[PDB]
Amino acid sequence: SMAMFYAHALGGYDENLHAFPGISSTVANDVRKYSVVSVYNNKYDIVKDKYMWCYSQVNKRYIGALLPMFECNEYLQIGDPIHDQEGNQISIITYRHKNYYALSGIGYESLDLCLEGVGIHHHVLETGNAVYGKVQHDYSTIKEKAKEMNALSPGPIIDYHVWIGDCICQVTAVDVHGKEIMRMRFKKGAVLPIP
Amino acid sequence: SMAMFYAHALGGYDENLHAFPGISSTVANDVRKYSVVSVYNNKYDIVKDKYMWCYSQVNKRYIGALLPMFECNEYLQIGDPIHDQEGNQISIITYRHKNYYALSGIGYESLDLCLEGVGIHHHVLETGNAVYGKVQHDYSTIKEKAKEMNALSPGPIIDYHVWIGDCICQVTAVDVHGKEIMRMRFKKGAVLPIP
Ligand SMILES: Nc1nc(=O)c2ncn([C@@H]3O[C@@H]4CO[P@](=O)(S)O[C@H]5[C@@H](O)[C@H](n6cnc7c(N)ncnc76)O[C@@H]5CO[P@@](=O)(S)O[C@@H]3[C@@H]4O)c2[nH]1
């Protein structure tokens, strides 16, 4: 049947369709392979070695991922179809960070969460800072806190924290005492969308 | 260049572009002439003798008009193109009332307002009700109300009221005491959009 793309920001979420940041679609496009995309007969270049952390929270389901992004100085509307050079539609306009536009679909490192009972928060990780739990600081302070919190018994996860830095991205999970229960690292630099 | 359509609901109002209910566009399409439209390669019939009163409030400027509307049980997303039989985009999805979708552009009777210092309010005119000023009731109550308010000295207009009924549409303008200062009547039946 027809390849549909519904934007989550317009209420288009369908659990029976493939779900990506800001997109429910009938087909699952791998957008990692493209270096140039087109929007209304206009070609744009995919940014190399810099990505955009994009997420959408629908019902109690978090859908986050590191996505490719292309630069475009003109204003492009949410829902605008994105094509490849062969005429195929591969995505729609979703998220934006100044002159950068995310390319949503099957991308790079991703995170999916049941948000029932837990929260999630997003931070810009300042360069040079380490991360423990729900805080970011210099290595010495983070290191000493990790040893301090080490003597505590782990409680249940209550919050997730996403840290988006220019060279690394990390996700931590904390209990009620701020103790780090879990930590993932994505070895990519990225930016967050500007609403 | 290429014919562009921007949905007002997505922040795409441009005062230098043609402005219609929910649409800023580089072209001004007269949509009264169409009896069928197509969305996602599906043909839909324009309803005959019933319209939709659509409006958007952008830049303290009110833009309202009776628009043609077509019946579609499927879900169509705001901003998606509307085509004619020849494949040309003539409009975008804007407003909806259950299984009816507006066809915005140059439509039928219209109302433009400068919304600074004056208000506007929309009402469904219940069948059999009469209207005075900012209120609707049965004809007996309205007759008495009109007599009472006749004795009042008129003041400057501060509010507009749009009455959309199955047989007729009317706009009244009231002063601070609710006296009717102006009334226009459109000899068409219509419905209001449902968000
Ligand atoms: N190992 C590792 N793998 C990578 O892939 C990686 N990428 C970048 N870096 C950075 O290199 C520096 C040295 O790492 P490290 O010395 S092992 O210190 C880590 C951790 O051991 C410490 N910590 C957490 N929990 C406990 C606990 N229960 N007890 C004791 N210590 C704990 O908290 C610190 C968090 O710092 P961060 O990870 S955000 O940045 C790192 C540091 O700045 C990486 N490090």
Tell me the backbone φ, ψ of residue B104, rounded to 5 degrees: -85, 155
Amino acid, res. B54: C
**Residue A136 and residue A119 in contact, taking contact as beta carbons nearer than 8 Å:** no
Cα-to-centroid distance, A142 and ligand 1 (Å): 9
- Which of A4, A12, A77 is facing B10, going by the closest CB pair? A77
> To one decimal place, what's the resolution in Å?
2.6
Element (H, E) at A191: strand A190-191
Residues B67, B141 within the same domain: no
- CA–CA distance from A52 to each of A21, A32, A155, B71, B175 (Å)? 11, 13, 32, 40, 53
**Dihedral sign, Cα of residue A34, residue A39, residue A44, residue A46:** negative
Q: Is A64 exposed, middle or buried (0-12, 13-18, 19+ CB in 10 A)?
A: buried
Residues A127, A113 within the same domain: no
Chain-chain contact of B12 with A77 (C-beta, under 8 angstroms):
yes
**Residue B160 and residue B120 in contact, taking contact as beta carbons nearer than 8 Å:** yes
Strands of A18-20's sheet, edge to edge?
A5-7, A23-25, A18-20
Rounded Cα distance between B22 and B84, Å, is 19
Residues A134, A104 within the same domain: no
Distance of CA B36 to the CA centre of its chain: 20
Rounded Cα distance between A32 and A19, Å, is 16
User: What DSSP state is assigned to residue A142?
Assistant: H
**Residue A80 and residue A39 in contact, taking contact as beta carbons nearer than 8 Å:** yes
Closest by Cα among A32, A47, A142, A38 to A89: A38
Cα-to-centroid distance, A112 and ligand 1 (Å): 24
Rounded Cα distance between B51 and B67, Å, is 6
Residues A49, A113 within the same domain: yes
Residues A160, A72 within the same domain: no
User: What is the token pair recorded at B95?
Assistant: 């407003």
Nearest CA distance, A23 vs chain B (angstrom)? 13
**Dihedral sign, Cα of residue B9, residue B13, residue B18, residue B19:** positive
Chain-chain contact of B77 with A2 (C-beta, under 8 angstroms):
no
Q: Is A118 exposed, middle or buried (0-12, 13-18, 19+ CB in 10 A)?
A: middle
Q: Is A180 exposed, middle or buried (0-12, 13-18, 19+ CB in 10 A)?
A: buried
Chain-chain contact of B77 with A78 (C-beta, under 8 angstroms):
no
If you write DSSP's letter for every residue of A64-88 in order, what string do you get?
EEEE-EEE-SS---TT-EEE-TTS-
Residues B109, B126 within the same domain: no
Closest by Cα among B108, B94, B106 to B190: B108
Strand bridging mode B61-67 / B190-191:
unpaired
**CA nearest ligand 1 atom 17, residue:** A143
Rounded Cα distance between B193 and B51, Å, is 11
The 3-state secondary structure of chain B reads CCCCEEEHHHCCCCCCCEEECCEEECCCCEHHHCCEEEECCEEEEECCCCEEEEEEEECCEEEEEEECEEECCCCCCCCCEEECCCCCEEEECCCEECCEEECCCECCCEEEEECCCCEEEEEECCCCCEEECCEEECHHHHHHHHHHHHCCCCCCCCEEEEEECCCCEEEEEECCCCCEEEEEEECCCEECCCC
Residues B110, B152 within the same domain: no
Chain-chain contact of B79 with A10 (C-beta, under 8 angstroms):
yes
Rounded Cα distance between B154 and B172, Å, is 14
Residues B85, B8 within the same domain: yes
Cα-to-centroid distance, A40 and ligand 1 (Å): 46
Tell which residues of chain B come right before a gap with C–N over 2.5 A. Answer: none
Count of Cβ atoms closer than 10 Å to residue A1 Cβ: 5
Rounded Cα distance between B153 and A80, Å, is 54
The residues of B assigned a catalytic role are 18, 139, 143
Closest by Cα among B118, B17, B109 to B66: B109
Closest by Cα among B77, B100, B94, B115 to B189: B100
Element (H, E) at A55: strand A51-58
User: What is the token pair recorded at A28?
Assistant: 């699952």
Mutate to test the interface with B, among A10, A17, A23, A94 (most CBs of B within 10 A): A10
Nearest CA distance, A195 vs chain B (angstrom)? 12
Rounded Cα distance between A72 and A96, Å, is 10
Tell which residues of chain A come right before a gap with C–N over 2.5 A. Answer: none
Q: Which residues of A143-173 are buried (b: 16+ CB within 10 A; e: fewer)?
A: eebeeebeeeeeeebbbbbbbbbeebbbbbb
Residue ranges making up the domain that contains B67 = 1-118+188-195
Tell me the backbone φ, ψ of residue A110, rounded to 5 degrees: -135, 160
Strand bridging mode B100-102 / A69-71:
unpaired
- Residue B78 with chain A: CB contacts under 8 Å: 10, 79
Residues B94, B35 within the same domain: yes
Residues A64, A137 within the same domain: no
Terminal CA-CA length for chain B: 33
Count of Cβ atoms closer than 10 Å to residue A108 Cβ: 16
Chain-chain contact of B2 with A41 (C-beta, under 8 angstroms):
yes
Amino acid, res. A27: V
**Residue B86 and residue B70 in contact, taking contact as beta carbons nearer than 8 Å:** no
Element (H, E) at A144: helix A139-150
User: Which structural technique was applied?
Assistant: X-ray
**Residue A65 and residue A54 in contact, taking contact as beta carbons nearer than 8 Å:** yes
- CA–CA distance from B167 to each of A167, B47, B184, B191 (Å)? 64, 14, 15, 10
User: What is the token pair recorded at A144?
Assistant: 């000493």
Residues A136, A175 within the same domain: yes
Provide residues with CB under 6 Å of ligand 1: A 130-132, 139, 142-143, 146-147, 150, 168, 170, 180, 185
User: What is the token pair recorded at B135?
Assistant: 């209120």
Nearest CA distance, A152 vs chain B (angstrom)? 48
- Which of A12, A75, A77 is facing B7, going by the closest CB pair? A77
Rounded Cα distance between A82 and A92, Å, is 5
- Which of A2, A12, A78 is facing B10, going by the closest CB pair? A78
Count the domains in chain A: 2
Strand bridging mode A130-132 / A135-137:
antiparallel
- Which of B6, B10, B77 is facing A6, going by the closest CB pair? B77
Cα-to-centroid distance, A175 and ligand 1 (Å): 19
Residues A149, A96 within the same domain: no
